[PDB]
């Protein structure tokens, strides 16, 4: 299945943020975001929020009903989405991607709502939407993935187990912000370990993409396929505005499929690498920065974009490309009893028998998810990257 969009369709989507209705003007802090969306589709520098909206928008143009709901989801928790803009003078609302979809002639819709302060009812409502209309694309977003434990009954009893129990399928998308940035125990972990503990028989797809274009292709592959199973995506916070994370337009128009594993872009000679680091998420960019600063041509950093199912064939192909590798390190921000390490330490060695013994590099095991002191977090992050390289 090819998930790329035409160059013409990409420019049309970008031009929707310029087709403002008669007598409508943006708020001056939202105006440069809209202006960058029109420039990005030819120049590049496409951020996470725009990569995600390019996917929801393209699907609505084909004729689908796209529904996105969550706390403060119109503007976005991190002031990044602006799917609905408001004129400060008249309080008039504008939804550019919905209007473009309605003008294509296939009755496509892009519906974005601000939910009430609820997780149990909120998520439950969106799971129900997916069951009442198989052909809709539905996404529930949490303020922070840490608050999804207040909807545990819906995760355990419907989303992760519905097909096995009753033969009832769903295509619900869970957008759960996750990332260790020093914001405390309730603003750092979406509990990846818990979601991977509920996975078996390919029950649901779990992913942590690192580039806006890969998130675009993941959402589009899920929507255009007949694999009627949920999609759990661990979305970023600081990586939303990282300049090294942005994508070029060719990543949406020339790149045809979603990538399970992304090989290292900065490798001069593959025969000289001796260490191989496996990582997943925003931590890649920090590790890559350190590799350039120190000039380490003996290390290779490979990203695992899809966590479940385990893309063991693509990981095997990547490790085969470095024939003089002596050790394989699994590097993550999360504590030793959390994150994707517990799942991968059990299953990856049995799926790739010739791979060397994996060595963990992470934060120490903890009762809580993360420290409450920001200075302690920065010290732990330095210790983590130092341990990986030495």
């Amino acid at each position: 299945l090819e998930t790329n969009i035409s160059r013409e369709e990409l420019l049309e989507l970008g031009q929707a943020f310029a087709n403002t209705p008669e007598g409508f003007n943006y708020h001056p802090r939202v105006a440069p975001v809209a202006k960058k969306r029109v420039s990005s589709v030819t120049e590049g520098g496409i951020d996470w929020a725009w990569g995600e909206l390019l996917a929801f928008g393209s699907l609505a143009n084909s004729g689908r009903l796209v529904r996105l709901a969550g706390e403060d989801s119109r503007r976005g928790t991190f002031t990044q989405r602006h799917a609905v803009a408001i004129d400060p003078a008249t309080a008039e609302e504008f939804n550019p991607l919905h209007e473009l979809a309605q003008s294509k002639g296939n009755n496509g819709k892009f519906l974005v709502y601000n939910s009430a302060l609820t997780e149990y009812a909120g998520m439950g409502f969106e799971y129900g939407y997916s069951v009442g209309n198989e052909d809709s694309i539905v996404a529930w977003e949490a303020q922070f993935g840490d608050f999804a434990n207040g909807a545990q009954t819906i995760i355990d009893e419907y989303v992760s187990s519905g097909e096995a129990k009753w033969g009832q399928t769903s295509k619900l998308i869970l957008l759960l912000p996750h990332g260790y940035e020093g914001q405390g125990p309730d603003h750092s972990s979406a509990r990846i370990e818990r979601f991977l503990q509920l996975c078996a028989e390919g029950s649901m797809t779990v992913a942590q993409p690192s580039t806006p274009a890969n998130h675009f292709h993941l959402l589009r592959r899920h929507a255009l396929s007949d694999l009627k199973r949920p999609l759990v995506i661990f979305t970023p916070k600081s990586m939303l505005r990282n300049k090294a994370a942005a994508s070029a337009p060719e990543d949406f128009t020339e790149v045809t499929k979603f990538q399970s594993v992304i090989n290292d872009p900065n490798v001069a000679d593959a025969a000289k690498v001796k260490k191989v680091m496996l990582v997943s998420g925003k931590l890649y960019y920090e590790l890559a920065k350190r590799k350039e600063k120190d000039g380490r041509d003996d290390i290779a950093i490979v990203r695992i974009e899809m966590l479940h199912p385990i893309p063991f064939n693509r990981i095997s192909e990547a490790l085969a490309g470095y024939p003089n590798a002596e050790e394989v390190l699994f590097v993550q921000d999360e504590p030793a009893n959390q994150g994707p390490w517990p799942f991968y330490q059990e299953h990856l060695p049995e799926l790739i028998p010739n791979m060397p013994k994996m060595r963990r590099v992470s934060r120490r095991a903890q009762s809580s998810t993360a420290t409450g002191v920001a200075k302690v977090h920065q010290l732990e992050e330095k210790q983590l990257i130092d341990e990986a390289f030495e």
Binding site: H27, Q143, G184
Partner: protein, 262 residues
């Protein structure tokens, strides 16, 4: 015993619990618990004041705080006419109406093993929740409408009239001691700044923030109101302002588990 979210927590620690400035300042502080004492200026009564620890998950402290109160009441053991540990529980308007744990905990108020003589609820109703307005937060007329389900009274009071606010506080505490039931105070106020540091609240709510930006504070408005009606004299009004600057100057320079072996 106080249960509350982050908004105004350090203010409550200094002016209500009575902790010294040096102890407060040395986001961890915004989740820890504390203890203090309250003496009354016009009386000879004393009362202990405690603050309970809680996570960032809003309203999760509600059942925990009730349980803390019941344990302290059982240890004193004063019977049916006792119930001398008062639960003072603070909420936000969006969280009170939206999260189901709020009415689930209030359902325990009259039950045999959970009764604590009633809870005083204060909803800081600033008519906003991050970027969400009440039209998308609740299907209830008022934020505090779970009170009508439990047969409890509600007092909606204007946050810019401090005389009416202190009266409601007294009446609600008098009602709790006489009837042993929950009481709900809806403090109708507003939120002056945005939800976080990097947020322009006029991006999403421009019309509401036309009325908020550049208005007199509750302190300044009340001083000017008393001076206008003749309730404060010109000389007496100048002293209140000098006292406000004195309180600021003083606060600003306040720098000077083992296993049972055997």
């Amino acid at each position: 015993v106080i249960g509350m979210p982050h908004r105004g927590r350090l203010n409550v620690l200094f002016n209500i619990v009575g902790k010294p400035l040096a102890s407060i300042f040395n986001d961890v502080k915004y989740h820890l618990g504390s203890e203090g004492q309250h003496l009354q200026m016009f009386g000879d009564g004393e009362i202990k004041v405690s603050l309970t620890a809680n996570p960032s998950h809003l309203e999760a402290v509600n059942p925990v705080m009730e349980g803390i109160v019941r344990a302290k009441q059982d240890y004193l053991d004063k019977g049916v006419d006792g119930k001398t540990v008062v639960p003072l529980l603070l909420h936000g308007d969006a969280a009170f109406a939206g999260l189901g744990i709020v009415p689930e905990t209030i359902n325990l108020a009259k039950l045999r093993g959970y009764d604590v003589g009633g809870t005083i609820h204060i909803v800081v109703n600033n008519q906003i929740g991050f970027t969400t307005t009440p039209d998308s937060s609740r299907s209830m007329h008022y934020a505090t409408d779970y009170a009508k389900a439990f047969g409890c009274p509600v007092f909606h009071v204007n946050g810019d009239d401090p005389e009416a606010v202190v009266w409601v506080g007294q009446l609600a505490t008098e009602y709790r001691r006489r009837f042993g039931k929950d009481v709900f105070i809806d403090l109708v106020c507003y939120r002056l700044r945005g939800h976080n540091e990097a947020d322009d609240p006029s991006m999403t709510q421009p019309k509401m923030y036309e009325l908020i930006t550049g208005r007199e504070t509750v302190r300044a408005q009340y001083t000017e109101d008393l001076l206008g009606r003749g309730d404060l004299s010109n000389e007496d009004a100048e002293a209140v302002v000098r006292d406000f600057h004195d309180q600021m100057e003083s606060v600003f320079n306040e720098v000077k588990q083992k296993l049972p072996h055997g």
